[PDB]
Amino acid sequence: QQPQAKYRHDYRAPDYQITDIDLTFDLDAQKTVVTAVSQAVRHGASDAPLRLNGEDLKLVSVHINDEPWTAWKEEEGALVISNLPERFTLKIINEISPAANTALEGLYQSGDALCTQCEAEGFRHITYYLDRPDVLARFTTKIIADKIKYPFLLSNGNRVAQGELENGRHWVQWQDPFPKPCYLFALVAGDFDVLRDTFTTRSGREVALELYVDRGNLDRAPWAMTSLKNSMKWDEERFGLEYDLDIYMIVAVDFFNMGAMENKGLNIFNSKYVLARTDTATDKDYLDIERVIGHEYFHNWTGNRVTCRDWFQLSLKEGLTVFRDQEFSSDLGSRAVNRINNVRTMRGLQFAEDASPMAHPIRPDMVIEMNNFYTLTVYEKGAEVIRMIHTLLGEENFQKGMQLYFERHDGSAATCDDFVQAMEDASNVDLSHFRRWYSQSGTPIVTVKDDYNPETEQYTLTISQRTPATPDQAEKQPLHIPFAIELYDNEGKVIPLQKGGHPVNSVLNVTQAEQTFVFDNVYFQPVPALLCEFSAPVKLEYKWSDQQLTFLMRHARNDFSRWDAAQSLLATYIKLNVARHQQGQPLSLPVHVADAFRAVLLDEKIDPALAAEILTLPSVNEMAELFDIIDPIAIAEVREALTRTLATELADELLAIYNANYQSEYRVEHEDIAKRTLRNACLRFLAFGETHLADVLVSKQFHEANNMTDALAALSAAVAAQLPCRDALMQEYDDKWHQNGLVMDKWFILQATSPAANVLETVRGLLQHRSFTMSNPNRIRSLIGAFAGSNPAAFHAEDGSGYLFLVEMLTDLNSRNPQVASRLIEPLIRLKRYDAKRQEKMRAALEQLKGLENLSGDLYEKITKALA
Ligand SMILES: [NH3+][C@H]1CCc2ccccc2CC1(O)O
Ligand SMILES: [Cl-]
Ligand SMILES: [Cl-]
Ligand SMILES: [Cl-]
Ligand code: NA
Ligand code: NA
Ligand code: NA
Ligand code: NA
Ligand code: NA
Ligand code: NA
Ligand code: NA
Ligand code: NA
Ligand SMILES: [Zn+2]
DSSP, X not given: OOOOOEEGGGOXXXXXXXXXXXXXXXXXXXXXXXXXXXXXXXXXXXXXXXXEEOSSOEEEEEEETTEEOOSEEEETTEEEEOSOOSEEEEEEEEEEOGGGOOSOOEEEEETTEEEEEOTTTTGGGTSSBOOSXXXXXXXXXXXXXXXXXXXXXXXXXXXXXXXXXXXXXXXXXXXXXEEEOGGGXXXXXXXXXXXXXXXXXXXXXXXXXXXXXXXXXGGXXXXXXXXXXHHHHHIIIIIOXXXXXXXEEEEEESOOSSSEEOOTTEEEEEGGGTOOOTTTOOHHHHHHHHHHHHHHHHTTTBTTTEEESSGGGHHHHHHHHHHHHHHHHHHHSOHHHHHHHHHHHIIIIIHHHHTSTTOOOSSOSEESSGGGGOOHIIIIIHHHHHHHHHHHHHHHHHHHHHHHHHHHHTTEEXXXXXXXXXXXXXXXXXXXXXXXXXXXXXXXXXXXXEEXXXXXXXEEEEEEEEOOOBTTBSOOOOOOEEEEEEEEOTTSOBOOOEETTEEOOSEEEEOSSEEEEEEOOOOSOOEEEESTTOOSSOEEEOOOOHHHXXXXXXXXXXXXXXXXXXXXXXXXXXXXXXXXXHTTXXXXXXXXXXXXXXXXXXXXXXXXXXXXXXXXXXXXXXHHTTOSSOOHHHHHHHHHHHXXXXXXXXXXXXXXXXXXXXXXXXXXXXXXXXHHHHHHHHHHHHTTSSHHHHHHHHHHHHHXXXXXXXXXXXXXXXXXXXXXXXXXXXXXXXXXXXXXXXXXXXXXXXXXXXXXTTHHHHHHHHTTOTTOOTTOHHHHIIIIIHHHHHOHHHHTOTTSHHHHHHHHHHHHHHHHOHHHHHHHTGGGGGGGGSOHHHHHHHHHHHHHXXXXXXXXXXXXXXXXXHHO
């Protein structure tokens, strides 16, 4: 039988705590023997049994105070031990098999290395334990292994003992002084190259930094090391937080379901978020390494020193740590580009989740499989909620709140409500209504109407809000929405906001279903900028004229507003042209719209970083969110037609800006990255110029590129525009790079997202490619996941072939690696957003999956919601 849902309202403090655990691993890939000696204390009723979680363990023995115990039973997922004293020593010996662990949860093999992933509930795959994050224990870990195969034996904390044994084995013992929940346990065993460096904290603590990579990869490690030092310095400067241990280890592994993991003092990272060299990694890879290194470092305080009482509180650490990583990237780099791209993710991907059958509040109320809740909502919307607190409080108050949060909760497992209370108490800002953001799912819609009264020189905004019902929640209530505005006069000058002789804050508190805001001394009919810096995670309904939007593109003070105005301008014409496509009619675009983009190209005063984003059209997933019923073929074809029309109308300006932004030196420096992003944004359109001009330009860039950013931009353009050189360039890239999986992932993505008519045949054939394997999550995501999630036009082919392909892949992955399967099923659970014929085929696919033998809980949860 499938597992039953668990509910946030059922939280109960544990009947037993474990204060200290001494682990011994006698390591082997086929068989590992685990000995766990735990010091336990009863907190609950004297007759309560100890209920330990365990999965796929071979129990060898149970002792209580060294007495072999008879009062125990194994049940599904558990070991239940009765008749215990109030305080006692529990000793469990059990066996596990890392080589059999294809799910990559618990202790498993990554190539020749052994490594762990314990979040959320993986430690119970290692031993029988209280695998819940409000149980905080001091760990000591002894690792015994063959010395030749496993010369490095790592766990959390500091090395406290080591020895050698007969028959070529050796051992190391680690001690981590900070009590932790078991999801933060890590173990690594293998042979590695190690990059070693040092960071000295502002108070003088010297921290040894160690980055473990596969042999031969040292020259790909310096950027990650530099980013770790940058993260440590920034957390000191911005948050006043120092690292708290003596060593900081990071291990890069090739086989990893997640991007990275914040295990205390021993982070484990997917190699994608560590390894970089300029010929193999793009600017985006460099900035993603920076943000993920930062994210995991920032968890040391927001997640580790203060952890989560229960898994429904996941956003307590994830929303806050994502906010921290965004602030880090934004401070060091381009704040406008960071904000823009985070808003693209919110509007184009998280909004889709929040109206889907999987919709949940950032603090869920009901979960079947927790590892399904590591979501865009919990992370990205979670961060938007933190950012709204920051908007309401300001930086100084926000940092006072952080300080009070740590003062109260350091060394504990806390709740979202605890965090909000700390912010409220430190700042004196009332967040009682604001708390509804934690409990209500769905995207609010904010509708704005305006009126300018020339007789009284008053401007009035009438603002309404509503959240449509979602499948998880029938009751919706108004939220406390921080709604930032700016008003512009006819010369683009800001109009001071005031009423009754007093200044009015530009962040309006939209707290009611409907309310009005009156501003006086408004000497001219304003052009408003609304929802500035995306001040709340909402859909905005305001009846813009095209002229208001092009005005904002020329005059708005914040770069984000200029980009956002361009998005609103495009939205009207994307919608127009999708409707036209459905009636067989070609693209129609007023001249004045093309001219707004011409002006961006020719404006010497605009930051190239901003111009590049304005000249990057919304993705097909961003476009889908504009529509009640998604027509993925119309969207894809309109996106191409819009690209072609702009390429034709702007051909001379695009080429001039492309050439003007040429850089002979390659540097991973923000100003250079911006110029390159602008040059390559122009290239996307130039690829749709006259076929031969485009073919020459694109092939030249590919062959002359001195860095992977420019080479991949050219290759992507050859695929997108189906240029003559495409097949030759794609083969050259394969021949050069086939032994490098991270580099080939880029090529698999291009294959999977190709506009070619035969894309599915190509994708299917690539299941046999020398660089592809179903054993590697990165390869799976880059080929299969990109097809289903990033090529909706082909995934939603009207013959249903895309659904049948995904069913085949999920039939394999349901058994092999359910976490990856559950990420890959997401496109099918969006069926109610599609036309009836597509829904019928998608339902049939889901019903096939529902009937699988040994259906994983991961997929069961999503399938059940989708078929309801
Ligand atoms: N705590 C981990 C959990 C794994 C995971 C899943 C989804 C996005 C990011 C991450 C990285 C993380 O650091 O947040
Ligand atoms: Cl073995
Ligand atoms: Cl590696
Ligand atoms: Cl700005
Ligand atoms: Na004892
Ligand atoms: Na910055
Ligand atoms: Na589970
Ligand atoms: Na997981
Ligand atoms: Na009006
Ligand atoms: Na208006
Ligand atoms: Na302001
Ligand atoms: Na292969
Ligand atoms: Zn995280």
